[PDB]
Amino acid sequence: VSKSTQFEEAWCLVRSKYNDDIRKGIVLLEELLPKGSKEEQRDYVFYLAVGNYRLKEYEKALKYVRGLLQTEPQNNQAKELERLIDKAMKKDGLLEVL
Amino acid sequence: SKSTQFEEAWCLVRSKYNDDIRKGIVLLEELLPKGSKEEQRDYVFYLAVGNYRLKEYEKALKYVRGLLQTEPQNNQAKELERLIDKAMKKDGLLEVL
Numbered sequence: 631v632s633k634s635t636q637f638e639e640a641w642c643l644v645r646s647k648y649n650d651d652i653r654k655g656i657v658l659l660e661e662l663l664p665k666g667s668k669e670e671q672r673d674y675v676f677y678l679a680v681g682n683y684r685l686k687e688y689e690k691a692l693k694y695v696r697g698l699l700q701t702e703p704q705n706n707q708a709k710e711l712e713r714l715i716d717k718a719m720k721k722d723g724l725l726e727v728l
Numbered sequence: 729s730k731s732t733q734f735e736e737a738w739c740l741v742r743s744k745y746n747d748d749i750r751k752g753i754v755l756l757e758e759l760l761p762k763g764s765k766e767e768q769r770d771y772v773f774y775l776a777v778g779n780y781r782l783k784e785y786e787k788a789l790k791y792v793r794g795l796l797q798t799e800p801q802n803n804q805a806k807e808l809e810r811l812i813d814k815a816m817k818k819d820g821l822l823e824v825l
Binding site for chain 1: 758760761762768771772775790791794795797798
């Protein structure tokens with residue numbers, strides 16, 4: 631039932647090797663998001679970006695991390711994650727058309 | 729701006745067209761992190777409404793139940809929950825709204 635239980639569970643799933651676990655972790659984070667404080671929602675949003683990045687949902691991950699940067703332009707984790715997204719995207723495009 | 733995106737999402741989620749409702753859902757979900765608390769109230773309610781109308785019952789239920797956690801006496805939310813519960817039992821024509 632608990633909110634910490636869901637977030638701790640989702641933290642593990644988003645860190646997981648298996649894509650099914652990452653998807654479920656995102657599903658938990660999406661449900662937690664409307665229930666969080668403004669600061670928790672910032673954390674939730676960063677972890678939603680990470681999860682979608684690992685699932686190769688690069689456009690969704692980029693949308694989450696761009697939103698974080700609208701309001702926190704000095705956030706270095708978000709800048710770094712955006713850099714990583716850009717780089718995976720460029721390599722994935724190459725793979726598509728080879 | 730936030731107000732005009734919500735004004736567009738408000739129209740979309742109430743539209744007669746399924747395409748519109750989908751896009752309204754997209755827009756409310758982006759607004760969700762950006763809103764004050766008395767703003768997220770409306771965002772969460774209209775996400776539940778939109779998902780309900782597209783027969784995304786599990787999503788709609790998650791949204792309204794969270795709203796009922798914060799506002800146990802909210803009779804519009806409770807009514808929308810009653811509607812979701814009923815649509816989940818058998819595929820049919822969703823009630824007027």
